[PDB]
């Protein structure tokens, strides 16, 4: 059967004492006036987001529950039984029999690996709330000496169990009622002796929304701006380029010999799928530091001008490959712009570059007249003159050869051991993109609210055929606010206009909570032919 839950299932959301206050709480609650399933004395009811369980009886007919996923031995299931002496809780691989129900041995046949066990201590109403969040199974409860009653009573915490399992179904171990929880905002009124004596379900109806807006249980006559209606996206789409070839990262990172830092090597990366997961297989403990991005997000973006600069330095100079750093390497060899967007991947290459004898394949410029500008290369060997003399000639006194060799050896300490460095420079300045992460493209949905992703530009709105024409070098259009209002579809290359989803202001006309609970609703700046009416909770 089915019955009305009324205003039941409120539970103390925290462990803090409060008095003479109206507190707002966002949590998994039982919506007011909900349709609860009534069973009489039973089946395996699902676990949606948490359950409110009530039991009107006077004979302890209800003894426990069995939460789990398959409720068989192939998975792990939670077990809770209330034996007259104690309460037993056991998360453990249970081959539950088909009709569990005093001989406790008629519930499950086998109890394989048990990762958690626990033991503890006029009809009556035993209300319970079960939740499963972050591996914790939380239980709140309340007993009341008593169709569910129509009074207010709040449930107190009982136990949080670190059971570490998914719970999708449960069953009552044998009148019991089963309601379900949803994420809701509630306005709870605490008493002077700290008792929750009333609540408002903010999402129940317009009057409740007015009550929560004003933070009061009584509303005076008037018209109140309560919230804004917003059409929710029906579906999501992804539109990335059709390219499928993988980027030539192996020939960069897995190169037999790297360049010298003074003559550092630059490689252009284009027309490819850049899967950065292939990284993380370099000389372990490697440094992967990004500027303007996070390493974990690179796989989800699209890049315009991707360049891989590779060279070898000594370990203690890896700190110098960063914006604004100073030193021989950062001043005469390889400078990064202060506004660098990209990533520096450095890793010890002792077992590739060090030579017992002294490796002279890797040089660095130690003396330069002026510093270098960003991403500039100097491969000249003229003699540096630190003296006023006409040094023009050969080296000598105050006349130094500018390049010096690292002479990497296997016996050096880490600080002077070779490190292979790769700098990935890319412009996330949207623009037409050629390198993109591994991402699947859906179909293009027009004239409909959707979540969209165009080459990494994410948004929500309505896409329509645009009359604007982009120049070949343009991929997005921008408005006065500098928000993207037009986009060229990466695959078909058509121009789409982006418009926000339908939304507007809502006002509630109330004669006064004292006079009545009837309300009228004004959808501001909207005509009725356009007032949202979507049945399911999608609008």
């Amino acid at each position: 059967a089915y019955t009305n839950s009324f205003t039941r299932g409120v539970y103390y959301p925290d462990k803090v004492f409060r008095s003479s206050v109206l507190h707002s709480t966002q949590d998994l609650f039982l919506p007011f006036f909900s349709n609860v399933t009534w069973f009489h004395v039973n089946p395996v009811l699902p676990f949606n987001d948490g359950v409110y369980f009530a039991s009107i009886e006077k004979s302890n007919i209800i003894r426990g529950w069995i939460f789990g996923t398959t409720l068989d031995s192939k998975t792990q299931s939670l077990l809770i039984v209330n034996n007259a002496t104690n309460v037993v809780i056991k998360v453990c691989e249970f081959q539950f029999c088909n009709d569990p129900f005093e001989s406790e041995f008629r519930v499950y046949s086998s109890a394989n690996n048990c990762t958690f066990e626990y033991v503890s201590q006029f009809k009556n109403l035993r209300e319970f709330v079960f939740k499963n969040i972050d591996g914790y199974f939380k239980i709140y409860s309340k007993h009341t000496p008593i169709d569910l009653p129509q009074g207010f009573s709040a449930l107190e915490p009982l136990v949080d169990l670190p059971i570490g399992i998914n719970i999708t179904r449960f069953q009552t171990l044998l009148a019991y009622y089963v309601g379900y929880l949803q994420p809701r905002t509630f306005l709870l009124k605490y008493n002077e002796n700290g008792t929750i004596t009333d609540a408002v379900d903010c999402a129940l109806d317009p009057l409740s929304e007015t009550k929560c807006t004003l933070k009061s249980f009584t509303v005076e006559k008037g018209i109140y701006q309560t919230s804004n209606f917003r059409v929710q996206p029906t579906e999501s789409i992804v539109r990335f380029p059709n390219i499928t070839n993988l980027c030539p990262f192996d020939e960069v990172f897995n190169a037999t010999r790297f360049a010298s830092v003074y003559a550092w090597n630059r490689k252009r990366i284009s027309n490819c799928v850049a899967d950065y997961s292939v990284l993380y297989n370099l000389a372990p403990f490697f440094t992967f530091k990004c500027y303007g991005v996070s390493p974990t997000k690179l796989n989800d973006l699209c890049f315009t001008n991707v360049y891989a600069d590779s060279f070898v330095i000594r370990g203690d100079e890896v700190r110098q490959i960063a914006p604004g750093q100073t030193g021989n390497i950062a001043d005469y060899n390889y400078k990064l712009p202060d506004d660098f967007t990209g990533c520096v991947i450095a890793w010890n290459s002792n077992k590739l570059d060090s030579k017992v004898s002294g490796n002279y394949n890797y040089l660095y410029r130690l003396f330069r007249k002026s510093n270098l500008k960003p991403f500039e290369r100097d491969i000249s060997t003229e003699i540096y003159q630190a003296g006023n003399k006409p040094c023009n000639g050969v080296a000598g006194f105050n006349c130094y050869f500018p390049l010096r060799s690292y002479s990497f050896r296997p016996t050096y300490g880490v600080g002077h051991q070779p490190y292979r460095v790769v700098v990935l420079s890319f412009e996330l300045l949207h623009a037409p993109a050629t390198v993109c992460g591994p991402k699947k493209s859906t179909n293009l949905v027009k004239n409909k609210c959707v979540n969209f992703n165009f080459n990494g530009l994410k948004g929500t709105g309505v896409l329509t055929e645009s009359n604007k024409k982009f120049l070949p070098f343009q991929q997005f259009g921008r408005d006065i606010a500098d928000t993207t209002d037009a986009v060229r579809d990466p695959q078909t290359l058509e121009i789409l206009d982006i418009t926000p989803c339908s939304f507007g202001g809502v006002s509630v006309i109330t004669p006064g909570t004292n006079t009545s609970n009837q309300v009228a609703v004004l959808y501001q700046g909207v005509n009725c032919t356009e007032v949202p009416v979507a049945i399911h909770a999608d609008q």
């Epitope: 037999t256 010999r257 002792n350 077992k351 590739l352 060090s354 030579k355 017992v356 004898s357 490796n359 002279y360 394949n361 296997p410």
Partner: antibody, heavy 94, light 106 residues
Framework: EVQLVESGRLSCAAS????????MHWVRLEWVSG????????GYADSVKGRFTISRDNAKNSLHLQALYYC??????????????????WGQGT | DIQMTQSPSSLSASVGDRVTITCRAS??????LVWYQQKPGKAPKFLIY???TLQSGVPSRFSGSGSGTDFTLTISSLQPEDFATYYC?????????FGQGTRLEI
């Protein structure tokens, strides 16, 4: 794939790999001589100094050199000391 | 340096006979020594480098370890394809020197 034919002085003709990235050695096993990718580390044997000279023509992928002689390719780009220094591909003979 | 001294002059065994091989040297050469394999008539192959990271696609059974001149080749299931004159090759310094040949028998 790698092919190392000991054509022929001796003139090995490399194929199947990037000749410019690896060191090359003659061995007759009585190793004869070695040479690096840029010919910056040319190392001979105790019995050859002044007689045989090793060299390489990277443009044509040739190992030239003024028991049978082999044509091993080094697993790395430079002279003996390296954790990865070895002769991982040979030819046939001469 | 240096003088590789394969110290069996030769060895012999049968299918399933795990056999060990060794060779010595003048000075220390750390791990910069490899072991090749010359099957009769054929040219030498590669088995392992530094005695740890076995060459890819090579039967792991051929293996060994040791520093300086201590080098101990070690198989587990010596088989028809494991009969050949193996060499120890020092690579620490140049002139590079080879061994003389632990020609295995049938």
């Amino acid at each position: 794939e790698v092919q190392l034919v000991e054509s022929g002085r001796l003139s090995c003709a490399a194929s199947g790999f990037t000749f410019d990235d690896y060191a090359m050695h003659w061995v007759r096993l009585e190793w004869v001589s070695g040479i690096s990718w840029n010919s910056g580390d040319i190392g001979y044997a105790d019995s050859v100094k002044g007689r045989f000279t090793i060299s390489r023509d990277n443009a044509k992928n040739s190992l030239h050199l003024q028991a049978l002689y082999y044509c091993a390719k080094d697993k790395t780009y430079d002279s003996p000391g390296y954790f990865l220094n070895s002769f991982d591909y040979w030819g046939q003979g001469t | 340096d240096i003088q590789m001294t394969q110290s069996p002059s030769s060895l012999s065994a049968s299918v399933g006979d795990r056999v060990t091989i060794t060779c010595r040297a003048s000075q220390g050469i750390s791990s910069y020594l490899v072991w090749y394999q010359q099957k009769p008539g054929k040219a030498p192959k590669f088995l392992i480098y530094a005695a740890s990271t076995l060459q890819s696609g090579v039967p792991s059974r051929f293996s060994g370890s040791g520093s300086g001149t201590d080098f101990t080749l070690t198989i587990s299931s010596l088989q028809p394809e494991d009969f050949a004159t193996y060499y120890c090759q020092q690579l620490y310094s140049y002139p590079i020197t080879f061994g003389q040949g632990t020609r295995l028998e049938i």
